Amino acid sequence: VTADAALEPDERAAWLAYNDTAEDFPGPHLLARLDAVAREHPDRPAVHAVDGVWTYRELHRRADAVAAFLAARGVRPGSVVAIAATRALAPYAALLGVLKAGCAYVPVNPDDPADRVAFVLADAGATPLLLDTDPASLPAAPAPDVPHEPDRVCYVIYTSGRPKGVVMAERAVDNLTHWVVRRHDVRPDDRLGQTAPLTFDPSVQQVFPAWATGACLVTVPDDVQRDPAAFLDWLRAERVTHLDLVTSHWVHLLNAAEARPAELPDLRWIIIGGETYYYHQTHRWHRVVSSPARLNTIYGPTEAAVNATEHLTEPDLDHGQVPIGVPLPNYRLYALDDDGRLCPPGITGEIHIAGAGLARGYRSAEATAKAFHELEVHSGRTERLYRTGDLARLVRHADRWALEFQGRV
Numbered sequence: 001v002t003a004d005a006a007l008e009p010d011e012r013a014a015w016l017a018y019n020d021t022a023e024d025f026p027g028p029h030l031l032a033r034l035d036a037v038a039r040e041h042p043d044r045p046a047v048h049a050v051d052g053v054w055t056y057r058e059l060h061r062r063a064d065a066v067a068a069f070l071a072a073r074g075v076r077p078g079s080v081v082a083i084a085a086t087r088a089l090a091p092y093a094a095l096l097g098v099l100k101a102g103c104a105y106v107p108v109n110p111d112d113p114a115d116r117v118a119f120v121l122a123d124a125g126a127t128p129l130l131l132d133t134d135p136a137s138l139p140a141a142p143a144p145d146v147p148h149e150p151d152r153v154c155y156v157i158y159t160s161g162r163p164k165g166v167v168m169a170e171r172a173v174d175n176l177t178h179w180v181v182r183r184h185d186v187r188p189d190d191r192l193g194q195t196a197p198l199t200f201d202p203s204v205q206q207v208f209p210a211w212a213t214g215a216c217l218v219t220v221p222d223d224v225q226r227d228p229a230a231f232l233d234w235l236r237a238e239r240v241t242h243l244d245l246v247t248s249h250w251v252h253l254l255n256a257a258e259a260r261p262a263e264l265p266d267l268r269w270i271i272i273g274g275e276t277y278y279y280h281q282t283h284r285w286h287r288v289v290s291s292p293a294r295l296n297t298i299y300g301p302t303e304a305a306v307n308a309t310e311h312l313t314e315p316d317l318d319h320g321q322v323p324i325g326v327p328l329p330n331y332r333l334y335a336l337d338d339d340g341r342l343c344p345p346g347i348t349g350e351i352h353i354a355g356a357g358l359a360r361g362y363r364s365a366e367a368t369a370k371a372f373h374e375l376e377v378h379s380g381r382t383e384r385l386y387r388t389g390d391l392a393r394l395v396r397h398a399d400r401w402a403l404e405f406q407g408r409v
């Protein structure tokens, strides 16, 4: 009956070790920590976008104006509000203001076809108020009083497989934010580069950890990203300390660094994922990039709050596939066969994800039914699981259990 039924004790033990990830994080909820930072570090730079820099004081005053506007237009807590996803300051006031209003944001590329925008507004149940007026130039006002609710929806982000709106609530975002800050030692004087647009959820992993610590969110300009050599120059010039990259984009940077060895003395962390890559590439990186920067290899779908697993990439290895590693705090992952049985170590199965990272679901009740299911994995432990469509196997890597990606169904 249980998914681990046919496993021997040693095979069951490997999975129990792998998924031993429960962690309580200190003190106030995400928005309260953001408010505390703004009041303790008001003069610090909070966002450096393509059109200038806002202090924490200014960002929170602009966000407060947005929340007050939404309330004045009858947008009640638990509503969804569209924000125009650009590289400028205004979207940061928009999305923080939506959260201060007790609402969830849906990031919209203002260059998308009008027909696709129309679908997103209807599917998300989202008001276009902040698409039809500049959110940065709204009349000044304090944020209205929002009654406390647990696990409010924070965002609806569209991901494809056919667009589906992933509904992500505060406990998942708070959990991710604690991990980014604690795992990568984010400090007030740090500069978190945002490579992903606000329509792509690695942006979440840069924005909230910055504002939860008093660090500065530094938007990567469009023109810089598409030019690998310029991107390396820009990272040096802006003294970026933490960066999000998709694997293929990082490969473009590696080729540029091989052509012209780079110095990045201020860079401490690159969080990289999206595709399988190889220790030969990461070994080359560490020879041609003069930096203390460590590569944190990550895996995860949008449906499980950006990242689900992480591997600290060894710089001395130069052969084999980089594993996707161990679950984030309060995540549990299972490789299941076609009959929903837990695979032994070394056996390839489909990744199912449990824990604090899971989306509430999709906007579509049908899509939610097909993707999310309940399963007794071990005696006594019934899990809400998200089916990924991803394949992996549990392997031994440097005397520790790790997932190794094996492709898709």
Ligand SMILES: Nc1ncnc2c1ncn2[C@@H]1O[C@H](COP(=O)(O)CP(=O)(O)OP(=O)(O)O)[C@@H](O)[C@H]1O
Residues within 6 Å of the ligand: 158, 159, 160, 161, 200, 272, 273, 274, 275, 276, 277, 297, 298, 299, 300, 301, 302, 303, 324, 388, 390, 405, 408
């Ligand atoms: N480290 C890694 N190695 C291999 N595959 C990875 C990976 N990290 C992520 N993936 C793949 O990327 C998927 C997650 O995709 P998402 O992060 O949701 C963006 P997407 O859905 O590919 O694009 P979209 O949201 O723009 O439509 C995983 O389900 C897996 O297939």
